[PDB]
């Protein structure tokens, strides 16, 4: 049992490892990103509410006028989502915000004469999501690529190596707030540490702490040990500690129990650890000279003489010791400077700073930001509460606040958005600890050290910046303004906000122009993840490290997708099972196992959990509810295939499909061919264009249905059920009344899509594959779109192959194609072009639109109307005029058809502003446009009325019914019967009243369909009219075509060969294409021969069913052979049995199998070579599957048999047109006769540098005064060649260049003179 489309055509799937869950949808990064961007989400959490949280307080000055925020909502825009794109306007829903404004009276913080309640103030409009999750800016919808950037906060990297030619090991601590100023710290080769700002000049860090309302003692008392000494009459006894003698060699006598254990000149070892900690006597006979071996902490006043003994952080000396020993001061704490216990780094940076006080500690910060200004307390502090303690310039989100908590091993989660003293000291302590003996560094390439940003936050940021730039506006206009006698509409306007919000989405690095040529390219573009943009990774700045990615990304990112050329590894995506958290860090699911019992529960795990925890393997031998019968299972903890035991694993990989998402997952057996030598074919589907006719693949993987319904090109039954009627414009579907509502049940709407031209001349078309009377269900495809058939996916098509280089024509990569395609014309699509005819009112005679156009022919009047517009369906050639347009002086300045791009006029589109008189043709065009609307709504109205007839008569018969009021009664008066008053009667009344309401509900949009359609559009002032023509050119197969399949068959066509020269075989089957088995070592491409036999297997089955049904054997053969042909495989996870179904399902499904049996083979969990041979043996095919071939020229056998079979080939975009060009001579630049650039409109062509000097190196000296002198510079020599070649003489004397002498003219203004002499 399967779905109706699946039961209609069910594809065989293979596999030995059953899966538990299906494939979710991949469009979760735009719809979900924007829905949270615009919602009622108080406290912000990255939403418009977050924008309002910064403009919610608004305390004005001199009056305390409060402008509070209440709510915002967006209604239906003035323009829909299907006609605004056609008109060419900006799509924007009304961003209306309910703002309450209480302008308090002056001086009084409290008091208002009368409160003014602004109902939905108009600050502008923001784009919405039309039908797919994209933005619409200027006609064509715009897709902003999600940007990759680093995580907001502090990083710890090594960045060793180049250390000013010293080689001393160094580290750095780079901080990055959410959107504020960067505090990036680093180390010095001279064993120092300081602070920096925004990658700018260094700032002293041992003076700013004292500047922040601190003093000296809080500096020196928190970075060193304290060791109290004893001042007596002699030798200055002193009190030591094992926490000081742990690494400090006690070079003095240490007595314990009347004997010295550690004396001078010996190192304390483990035995001395016992000899010392077992005694730990404090009253030891320390000598006087060891007292000088310390460094004082602070100043001490001599208790005997009052003399300044020492100031701070200075080494004691024997004279100093005798200068304080003459007292009774038994409290002398000292520091502890070491080289391996404590960092000797803040020992000298204090002396490095010129001062450290209250006043001179601020002139440094005053002069670093505002030179030539006297220092001031308030101005100096303003920066401290601007770049460190602020809410509008420097602030961090919850992400930035909690990242530091984890980075510094904290416990709290939510705090403020500002830096704290504790954090800025701990970064100066754990960081100095990193050097000495502990610590670790974090790599930027790590997934947890980077942040992904999308449209949902970039738009919120833009709108919040927009609100903060207008916040102070009300404060300043209300500082000297009225007394609340206004309305909050004037000072807070819409033009600047709406223009900035709109431009910020269209003119940006991430605002990449959409390239609609493949629905798979549509999804690939939407899931494209890029690094460039505002605050990202630039292409010029790239080392060998940023180019290499952190290997811990398997199961989280698709590796097989990779850009080539200027950028490598810069374009990323999202895996199927894994997803990006709101934190931007990646995580992937795993199956929750226990020590012995495998549970089907799924948890989400990430790299940080993976580092410490051990994950088992997917393809692990399993039996009942789950037990690893094997003991030593290949596990992993840090990406290494660790071989660990069985009873510690609680998770393996969910499935092998979590690594690849969209790159090349449709190609089975990706292990045979490396992605390194397969990405040249795996990267060409992003530009491939669908053809006219496409066949189902014989071999795939099985994930084609989810990706097909994922793309927005199909018509899924969002509300399936009973299928009533299928139309070429709208599939008339509805469900029984039981599942919809008594009030306006309605019918299921499915409008059919017609041919259009989106971005890349792409003609999309949908065809209703369903029949008349075939029931469907929820989530069932109804109308097949491009490259789809019977609800499935088919991009390309299948054709047989041979492996035989004939006469060496396939020299490197060329291919040989016979005349089997050029006569059929099937491998081509339709491209619709567009040329814009500007009706600009030129000076001294505007541009008029009329048929009276000079220098035309008698054929023009037949194809042109009386207004100069070509007839609808009148073909044009090279040189015709689409719309007559002349400039009286008179010359024909209308549009001409260039030679080589001639097509057929199918659509002529005229855009004219309201006020300009139109021609009869155009008037008739909207005239027909309006009347088609009336009839097209009328049939919908009638079918809705008839459906409500079925619903109401159905409830009528169900219960009370009268024979007289049964069929002859009017179909409207269906609310007056003998039914008693109950839930049936009131429901019937509800149905009737809804029927009456819906019988007139349509008239509102009926009326709306004039005042928006009859009115003219608006494009730009200063032009009379803009008219466009959507000409379409159809091309055929011509010399110069290109071949590029899914396998990577990158080759250009060589020439044409006859079908007779095409080699036949023992029965003469015409082989479609023949490859060149020559580049196997250069291009390691082996994994195709084994899968080649699947094409023979499918054709063999299809032809056997065809022959077996041709004579129509009894059901004892039809249902027997169907059984055998559908029962196959050694261990498959799909059980299909058509014979056990009804006989009709047997024939109605066997009829779908005339050419082959679809096969779904996953790379790992699918059909293997053994399946290949068993299926070849299922029909009448040889075990080896090798077929001998005959010769078409001499008619013989060469030496060997040739493998022949069908693969699935697909078409690319570039054929000959993007490269074809031809030009001889004509117009050139204006400053000279230099040809223009590019080959598209008009210009010159490329040439290399080596031939430039190769010709000079040759003996021929005339090769230089021919190519760039009398070809591109000599204006009159050009006229000389024009005048004399047409006579016949072929000799031009070179004149003078007009490029070398031009440069000297502007330097002559600098005082340069030139002279001419001949020796």
């Amino acid at each position: 049992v399967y779905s109706y489309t699946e039961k209609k055509r069910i594809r065989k799937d293979f596999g030995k490892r059953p899966q538990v869950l299906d494939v979710p949808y991949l469009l979760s990064i735009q719809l979900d990103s924007f829905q949270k961007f615009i919602e009622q989400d108080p406290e912000g959490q990255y939403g418009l509410e977050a924008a309002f949280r910064s403009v919610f307080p608004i305390q004005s000055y001199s009056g305390n006028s409060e402008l509070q925020y209440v709510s915002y909502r967006l209604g239906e825009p003035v323009f829909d989502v299907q006609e605004c794109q056609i008109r060419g306007v900006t799509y924007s829903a009304p961003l209306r915000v309910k703002l309450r404004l209480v302008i308090y009276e002056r001086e009084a913080p409290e008091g208002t004469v009368k409160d003014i309640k602004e109902q939905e103030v108009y600050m502008g409009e923001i784009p919405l999501m039309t039908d797919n999750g994209t933005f619409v800016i200027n006609g064509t919808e715009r897709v902003i690529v999600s940007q990759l950037h680093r995580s907001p906060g502090v990083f710890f990297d090594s960045d060793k190596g180049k250390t000013h030619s010293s080689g001393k090991v160094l580290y750095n601590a780079r901080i990055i707030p959410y959107r504020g100023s960067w505090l990036d710290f680093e180390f010095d080769p001279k064993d120092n540490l300081f602070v920096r700002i925004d990658r700018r000049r260094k700032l002293p860090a041992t003076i700013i702490l004292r500047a922040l309302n601190y003093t000296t003692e809080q500096i020196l008392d928190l970075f060193f040990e304290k060791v109290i000494f004893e001042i007596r009459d002699n030798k200055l006894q002193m009190e030591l500690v094992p926490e000081r003698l742990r690494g400090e060699t006690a070079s003095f006598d240490i007595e314990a129990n009347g004997k010295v254990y550690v004396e001078k000149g010996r190192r304390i070892t483990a035995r001395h650890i016992r000899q010392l900690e077992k005694d730990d006597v404090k009253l030891i006979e320390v000598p006087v000279e060891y007292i000088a071996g310390k460094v004082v902490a602070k100043d001490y006043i001599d208790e005997s003489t009052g003399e300044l003994i020492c100031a701070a952080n200075m080494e004691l000396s024997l004279d100093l010791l005798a200068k304080l020993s003459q007292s009774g001061h038994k409290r002398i704490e000292t520091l502890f400077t070491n080289d391996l216990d404590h960092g000797p780094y803040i020992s000298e940076t204090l002396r490095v700073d010129p001062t450290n006080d209250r006043l001179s500690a601020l002139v440094e910060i005053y002069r670093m930001m505002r030179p030539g200004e006297p220092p001031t307390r308030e101005a100096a502090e303003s920066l401290f509460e601007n770049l460190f303690f602020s809410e509008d310039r420097y602030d961090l989100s919850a992400v930035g606040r909690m990242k530091f908590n984890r980075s510094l091993l904290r416990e709290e989660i939510e705090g403020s958005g500002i830096l704290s003293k504790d954090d800025i000291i701990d970064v100066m302590k754990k960081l100095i600890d990193i050097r000495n003996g502990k610590g670790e560094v974090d790599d930027i390439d790590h997934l947890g050290n980077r942040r992904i940003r999308s449209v949902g936050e970039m738009a919120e940021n833009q709108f919040r910046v927009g609100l903060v730039r207008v916040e102070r506006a009300v404060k300043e206009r209300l500082s000297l303004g009225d007394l609340d006698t206004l309305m909050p509409q004037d000072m807070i306007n819409a033009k600047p906000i709406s223009a900035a919000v709109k431009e910020f989405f269209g003119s940006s690095q991430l605002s990449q122009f959409m390239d609609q040529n493949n629905p798979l390219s549509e999804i690939t573009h939407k899931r494209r993840i890029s690094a460039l943009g505002p605050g990202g990774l630039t292409r010029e700045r790239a080392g060998f490290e940023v180019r290499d990615v952190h290997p811990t990304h398997y199961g989280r990112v698709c590796p097989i997708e990779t850009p080539e050329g200027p950028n490598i590894g810069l374009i990323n995506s999202l895996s199927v099972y894994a997803q990006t958290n709101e934190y931007g860090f990646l995580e992937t699911p795993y199956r929750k196992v226990t020590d012995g019992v495998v549970t089907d529960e799924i948890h989400y795990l990430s790299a940080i959990e993976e580092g410490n925890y051990v994950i088992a393997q997917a393809n692990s031998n399993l039996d009942e509810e789950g037990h690893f019968v094997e003991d030593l299972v290949t596990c992993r903890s840090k990406g290494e295939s660790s071989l660990f035991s069985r009873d510690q694993v609680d998770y393996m990989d969910v499935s092998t499909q979590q690594v690849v998402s969209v790159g090349a997952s449709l190609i089975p057996f990706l292990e045979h061919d490396d992605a390194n030598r397969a990405l040249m074919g795996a990267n060409m589907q992003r530009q491939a264009v669908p053809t006219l006719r496409a066949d189902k693949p014989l071999v795939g993987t099985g994930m084609e249905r989810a990706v097909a319904v994922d793309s927005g090109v199909t018509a899924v039954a969002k509300r399936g059920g009973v299928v009533q009627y299928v139309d070429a414009s709208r599939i008339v579907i509805k469900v029984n009344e039981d599942e919809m509502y008594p009030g306006e049940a309605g019918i299921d709407i499915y409008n059919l899509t017609k041919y259009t031209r989106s971005n890349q001349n792409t003609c999309i078309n949908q065809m209703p594959c369903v029949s008349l009377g075939e029931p469907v269900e929820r989530g069932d495809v109804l109308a097949d779109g491009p490259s789809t058939d019977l609800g499935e996916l088919a991009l390309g098509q299948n054709m047989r192959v041979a492996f035989m280089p004939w006469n060496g024509y396939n020299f490197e990569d060329s291919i040989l194609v016979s005349e089997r395609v050029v006569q059929e014309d099937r491998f081509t699509t339709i491209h619709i072009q567009e040329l814009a005819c500007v009706s600009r009112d030129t000076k001294l005679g505007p541009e008029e639109i009329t048929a009276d156009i000079p220098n035309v022919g008698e054929a023009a009047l037949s194809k042109l109307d009386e207004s100069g517009i070509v007839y609808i369906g009148a073909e044009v050639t090279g040189g015709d005029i689409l719309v007559g347009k002349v400039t009286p002086k008179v010359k024909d300045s209308s549009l001409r058809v260039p030679n080589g791009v001639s097509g057929t006029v199918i659509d002529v589109q005229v855009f004219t502003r309201d006020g300009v008189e139109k021609d009869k043709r155009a008037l008739e065009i909207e005239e027909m446009q309006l009347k088609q609307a009336k009839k097209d709504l009328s049939e919908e109205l009638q079918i809705l009325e008839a459906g409500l007839f079925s619903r109401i008569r159905a409830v009528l018969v169900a219960g009370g019914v009268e024979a007289e009021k049964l069929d002859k009664l009017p179909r409207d008066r269906w609310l007056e019967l003998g039914l008693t008053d109950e839930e049936k009667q009131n429901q019937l009344e509800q149905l009737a009243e809804q029927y009456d309401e819906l019988k007139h509900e349509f008239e509102k949009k009926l009326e709306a369909k004039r005042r928006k359609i009859t009115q003219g559009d608006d494009l730009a002032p200063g032009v009379l009219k803009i008219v466009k023509v959507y000409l379409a050119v159809k091309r055929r197969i011509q010399p110069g075509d290109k071949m590029a399949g899914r396998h990577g068959n990158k080759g250009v066509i060589s020439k044409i060969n006859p079908i007779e020269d095409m080699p036949y075989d023992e029965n003469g089957t015409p082989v479609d294409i023949v490859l060149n088995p020559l580049g196997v070592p250069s291009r390691m491409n082996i994994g195709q021969i084994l899968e080649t036999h699947l094409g023979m297997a499918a054709k063999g089955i299809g032809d056997k069913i065809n022959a077996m049904l041709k004579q129509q054997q009894e059901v004892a053969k039809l249902r027997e052979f169907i059984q055998r042909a559908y029962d196959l495989g050694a261990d498959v996870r799909q059980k299909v049995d058509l014979s056990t179904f009804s006989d009709e399902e047997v024939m109605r499904l066997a009829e779908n199998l005339r050419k082959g049996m679809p096969i779904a083979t996953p790379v790992f969990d699918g059909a293997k070579e053994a399946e290949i041979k068993e299926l070849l043996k299922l029909g009448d095919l040889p075990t080896s599957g090798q077929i001998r071939l005959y010769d078409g020229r001499t008619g013989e056998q060469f030496e060997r048999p040739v493998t022949v079979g069908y693969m699935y080939m697909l078409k690319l975009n570039h054929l000959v047109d993007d490269k074809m060009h031809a030009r001889s001579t004509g117009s050139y630049s204006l400053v000279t006769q230099q040809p223009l650039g590019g080959k598209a409109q008009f210009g010159g062509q490329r040439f290399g540098e080596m031939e430039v000097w190769a010709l000079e190196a040759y003996g021929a000296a005339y090769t230089l005064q021919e190519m760039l002198t009398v070809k591109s510079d000599d204006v009159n020599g050009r006229t000389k060649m024009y005048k004399n070649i047409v006579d016949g003489n072929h000799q031009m004397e070179p004149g003078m260049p007009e490029s070398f002498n031009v440069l000297l003219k502007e330097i002559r203004s600098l005082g340069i003179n030139i002279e001419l002499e001949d020796e």
């Binding site: 398997y554 035989m804 020299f811 200063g1022 010399p1039 040739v1202 290399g1248 430039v1252 070649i1285």
Partner: protein
């Protein structure tokens, strides 16, 4: 350029000058109101940066701008640099007189003609049509002459075809690696819509045959032909400048055609039975009676020009294969038949034509070598090439090898945890044993891949040269390297780990059976680095090439003899193993400095200042003299240049 309206858009050179003149107006106006020393001090600063702004910025502070955050375009931006006029007008400009079409193989042109299609050959030579209409009188005015060309009824192309043979054009390839990319091919007017190139020349440029770029160049004067007969063509420039190997490298599809041809069987079809005619043996070959590897002897006539060009009238009947005689009857005059008896691979065939130039000559040898592709096309048509699974044979001892390999790991790790060994040297031991643990499988697949094809022998079995399909091109050198064949059956080896050093866990299986995601990820992880680094090494190579090409260009030869009888000391440098380079590639065509004497008996070998081309060096190599004294380029008495004797002959000339 104007804008969308009645106004006009400004330029970079004027945007800032607008503001500096507007501010200068008010600064000068305030001067009449007795301005203090402050206004006069400040007004000079603005003119100082305005004048620096026009000249050049980005030296002091942040450069000013008037358009966006991007810096303004100064006067010294379009003159110098990558985008400057110096590298944009003469070094990558937009050239003219050329058309674009798709390249096909088209193995029809040989050296002289080309495959220029009809439309491409009609849409270019515009003025020559009007130049030739008036000769027969079809047109008397250019105005009316114009409106009989654009329609192309029957007379546009016949007139333009006869001016083709009287004026050859030049064709060059944009993706050119060598220096001799300029070859003279006469235009043709043939049907089709593509351009064909010589398959050897197409691979000669070493460019991907996937929609490359062509460029056509025509001489523009009469005197561009009288001198254009010896310089810009491949007829005389066969020798490559870089090396003694000429530009004509044997093709991969002809080398196999001769390597498998020279293969000798001991018992097959046509074995033993010998005919009495090379042509009748050839007929029995493609009639289905004689094999390409076969032992048949026929009356083959050999000739030698050891005389004064006189044919040595002789013949021979030796046991040859059937196609060697076919090649021999292509020799027009005659060469010592012993010269064609070899494996006929890369180097053997390369020095076939290399010595053929010096034996038979240049002009006939050109044709004799250009027909190699033609005569190998018969082989390509009759055999071709194919690959399949049956060529894969797993080694029989590989599974035992991999079974026994991991045993030592555990046997030493248990000693590590038992306190016998330390991971410091144990890790190095492990990565060293696994650095060679692939070699046993690598030579175990020799005896499982290249030793299979046997033949019968009078009733018994004889083993001879293997007939493995992938080994045909492997041993013949056509395609398939040692570093690639291991990737097929053997182990690809141990690549660099993400840490940077060698991986600790090698590759277990090959790409022919199942492979896990983790290790396939590791292999791709090691693999992308070469593709990443090729984007940068090529650019770095271009940097040095440009730094070394525009510096040595200024050289002129102004003297013939420098008047110096000295030079340098020539002796094959050798250190360590064997010497790789002889004197042959050192001195070849150079005027000797003085008379070299024989070391043994003091015999004058070269009498005076003479060249050293073929036989002089053959005298040196047979007399074993290492006292060569030739004029050296560094030691030359030539004013601004070097004389011809210090350099002598040059390659490609």
């Amino acid at each position: 350029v104007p804008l969308d309206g009645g106004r006009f858009a400004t330029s970079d050179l004027n945007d800032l000058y607008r503001r500096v003149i507007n501010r200068n107006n008010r600064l000068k106006r305030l001067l009449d109101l007795a301005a203090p020393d402050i206004i006069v001090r400040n007004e000079k600063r603005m003119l100082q940066e305005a004048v620096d702004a026009l000249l050049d910025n980005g030296r002091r502070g942040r450069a000013i701008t008037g358009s966006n955050k991007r810096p303004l375009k100064s006067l010294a931006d379009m003159i110098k640099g990558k985008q400057g006029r110096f590298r944009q007008n003469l070094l990558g400009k937009r050239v003219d007189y050329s058309g674009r079409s798709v390249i096909t193989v088209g193995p029809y042109l040989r050296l002289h003609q080309c495959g220029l299609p009809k439309k491409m050959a009609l849409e270019l030579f515009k003025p020559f049509i009007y130049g030739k209409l008036e000769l027969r009188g079809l047109a008397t005015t250019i105005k009316a002459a114009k409106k009989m060309v654009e329609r192309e009824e029957a007379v546009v192309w016949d007139i333009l075809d006869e001016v083709i043979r009287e004026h050859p054009v030049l064709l060059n390839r944009a993706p050119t690696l060598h220096r001799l990319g300029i070859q003279a091919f006469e235009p043709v007017l043939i049907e089709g819509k593509a351009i064909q190139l010589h398959p050897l020349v197409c691979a000669a440029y070493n460019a991907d045959f996937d929609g490359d770029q062509m460029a056509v160049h025509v001489p523009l004067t009469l005197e561009a032909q009288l001198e254009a007969r010896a310089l810009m063509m491949s007829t005389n420039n066969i020798l490559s400048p870089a090396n003694g190997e000429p530009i004509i490298v044997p093709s991969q599809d002809v080398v196999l055609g001769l390597y498998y041809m020279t293969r000798d069987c001991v018992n097959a079809k046509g074995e033993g039975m010998v005919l009495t005619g090379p042509k009748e043996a050839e007929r029995l070959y493609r009639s289905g009676l004689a094999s390409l590897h076969a032992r048949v002897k026929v009356r083959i006539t050999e000739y030698e020009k050891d005389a004064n060009g006189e044919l040595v009238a002789k013949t021979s009947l030796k046991d040859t294969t059937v196609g060697r005689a076919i090649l021999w009857m292509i020799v027009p005059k005659g060469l010592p038949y012993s010269i064609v008896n070899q494996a006929l691979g890369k180097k053997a065939i390369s020095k076939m034509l290399n010595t053929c130039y010096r034996i038979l000559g240049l002009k006939p040898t050109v044709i004799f070598a250009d027909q190699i592709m033609y005569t190998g096309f018969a082989y390509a048509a009759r055999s071709g090439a194919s690959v399949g699974i049956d060529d894969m044979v797993i080694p029989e001892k590989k599974h035992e090898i991999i079974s026994e390999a991991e045993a030592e790991v555990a046997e030493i790790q248990e000693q590590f945890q038992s306190g016998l060994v330390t991971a410091g040297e144990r890790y190095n031991k492990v990565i060293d044993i696994w650095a060679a643990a692939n070699d046993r499988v690598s030579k175990a697949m020799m005896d499982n891949l290249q030793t299979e094809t046997v033949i019968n022998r009078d009733g018994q079995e004889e083993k001879q040269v293997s007939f493995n399909s992938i080994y045909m091109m492997a041993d013949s050198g056509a395609r398939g390297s040692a570093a690639q064949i291991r990737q097929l059956a053997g182990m690809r080896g141990l690549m660099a780990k993400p840490d940077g050093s060698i991986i600790e866990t090698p590759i277990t299986a090959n790409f022919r059976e199942g492979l896990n995601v983790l290790q396939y990820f590791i292999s791709t992880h090691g693999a992308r680095k070469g593709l990443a680094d090729t984007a940068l090494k090529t650019a770095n190579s271009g940097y040095l090439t440009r730094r070394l090409v525009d510096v040595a260009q200024d050289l002129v030869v102004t003297e013939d003899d420098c008047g110096t009888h000295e030079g340098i000391m020539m002796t094959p440098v050798i250190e360590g193993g064997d010497v790789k380079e002889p004197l042959r590639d050192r001195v070849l065509g150079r005027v000797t400095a003085e008379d070299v004497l024989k070391p043994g008996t003091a015999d004058i070998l070269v009498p005076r200042n003479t060249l050293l081309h073929e036989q002089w060096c053959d005298l040196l190599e047979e007399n074993s003299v290492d006292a060569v004294k030739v004029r050296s380029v560094v030691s030359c008495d030539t004013d601004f240049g070097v004389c011809a004797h210090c350099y002598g002959r040059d390659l490609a000339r």
